[PDB]
Symmetry: C2
């Protein structure tokens, strides 16, 4: 019931396509990428060095991708503005190129005839949304952002903790392998971004990052100062509750001794790790949450697409 | 002047020998390891898969190890109590086996004739000392511990910060490769151990660890709540001063963008990373510090040996 077109056939674009093709109420009408041919696009989608071999059947006709009998238009336009989104009746253009992430730039998909646009990356200007955090604040805007995979791991946890105990302020560290033998620090805006999806925490969270050479699963290390005193059991219970409710598929929860790889391909946005965390005092605790670098995030991009539809 | 025997010929024991052999006032009279022969010990010391090919000349006579002329007796006793420490006039027995780390167990070396014992590992009973934190508090105790490499990295930092701004409480995370494709969480008493060498901080520090498949350099991520407000520059200035003075070789300081491997073989106990840390508010900051898994620690072991002599 919702027509979409995916711009960019990279790790994200391809995974979004895979997920979308499974949504009964979505109809992928096109994909675009100026750096590859239809033949190469078909080959990559089928034998994906990143996401593995596509179980379905794929082929093409030098003009359209044929997935399980479903034809998907393919273009190679370097400027989204020249795309036949209008002629194709594109309700939502999903841009996973990371180059048309602002309002002005992402506007092209609108000019081309696309009703709305969803940016699969954090934006400085477009309104950001995190499923399970503030997708309910969507007020019909035409161009939205889904933030980053890191922010999508942190934000839901920040929400749960702030709603139940309150967060005076927090400092995060994410140990990740987001796109050898080294631990490499860098800055990250993922923590500050939470302030964009949770206005009440604006200016109350920030952090940094350590890149490590591991499989495609990263982790969030959040050290927060609580408003109200709490025991670790109350904190666990608060998260666990949310993981059993409506946000069942977004917020994960475990109490086992895990290894990052255990979550490869997991679709939750964040998986709370009860055992990994530790509390020093009633108002000072370190919380841990895992996240696949792309599966949870990509599943949320499609969720956001259907929500804005 | 100072005669020492080294128990255990593993990673640490061998590095301790290399370093001890270079101290002008240390006389290495023996080593003990029940799991290897003199032939194997010699071959491993010269062709060390962990510390590289030993520069000096090494051979043996089936009884002693011969390094650059200097002769070192070799034994293979499973019970340190049967060792000839008294006969050889051993002043300090360095136990790097991690099997005699308590007062009752380490007591065996004393029973054998050694005047004192230095455990190259944290102990629940033996008093611990960290060069740069509380070695001056040594009071002639006969059995001491040098804590761990993680504690030797964190403690010096904790002291500097506590002395200048005061630490209300802190939570640490160490991303380390301490002895594939996985990030693995686990508990650690390394942070809590700071409370032993800095009683004023008892119960005010703890944390956890993440194991990663990287080279032999780890890092401590310290999120701390300060007593007195401070700017990141005052913090940087405070650590920098200490790294320029008497603790020059214990506390390192840098402001460059680094990768863990840049510190392989570094002998400081800790290298403060100004650029990697980040401050959220006047009394809530995240500090980062690097440490080679063995070089700084093994150097301290010898520093402590000469100090307690
Ligand atoms: O497998 C997907 C497609 O990859 C490319 C090939 O040229 C095409 O013939 C094939 O159908
Ligand atoms: O003396 C040099 C070498 O002699 C022979 C031994 O088997 C070896 O272990 C030793 O390193």
């Amino acid at each position: 019931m919702v027509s979409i077109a995916i711009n960019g056939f990279g790790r994200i674009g391809r995974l979004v396509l895979r997920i979308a093709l499974e949504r009964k109420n979505i109809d992928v009408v096109a994909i675009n990428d100026p750096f590859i041919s239809v033949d190469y696009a078909a080959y990559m989608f089928k034998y994906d060095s990143t996401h593995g071999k596509y179980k379905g059947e794929v082929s093409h006709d030098g003009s359209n991708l044929i997935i399980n009998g479903k034809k998907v238009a393919v273009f190679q336009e370097k400027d989204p503005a020249t795309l036949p989104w209008g002629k194709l009746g594109v309700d939502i253009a999903v841009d996973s190129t990371g180059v048309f992430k602002e309002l002005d730039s992402a506007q092209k998909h609108i000019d081309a005839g696309a009703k709305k646009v969803v940016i699969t990356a954090p934006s400085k200007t477009a309104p950001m949304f995190v499923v399970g955090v503030n997708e309910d604040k969507y007020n019909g805007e035409k161009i939205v952002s889904n933030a980053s995979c890191t922010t999508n791991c942190l934000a839901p946890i920040a929400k749960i903790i702030n709603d139940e105990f309150g967060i005076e302020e927090g400092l995060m560290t994410t140990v990740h392998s987001i796109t050898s033998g080294n631990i490499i620090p860098s800055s990250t805006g993922a923590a500050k971004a939470v302030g964009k999806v949770l206005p009440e925490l604006q200016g109350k969270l920030t952090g940094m990052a350590f890149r490590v050479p591991t499989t495609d699963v990263s982790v969030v290390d959040l050290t927060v100062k609580l408003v109200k005193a709490a025991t670790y059991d109350e904190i666990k219970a608060a998260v666990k509750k949310v993981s059993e409710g409506k946000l069942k598929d977004v917020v994960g929860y475990t109490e086992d001794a895990v290894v990052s790889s255990d979550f490869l391909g997991d679709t939750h946005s964040t998986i709370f790790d009860a055992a990994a965390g530790i509390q020093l005092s009633p108002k000072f605790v370190k919380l841990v949450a895992w996240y696949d670098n792309e599966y949870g995030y990509s599943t949320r991009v499609v969720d956001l697409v259907e929500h804005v539809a």
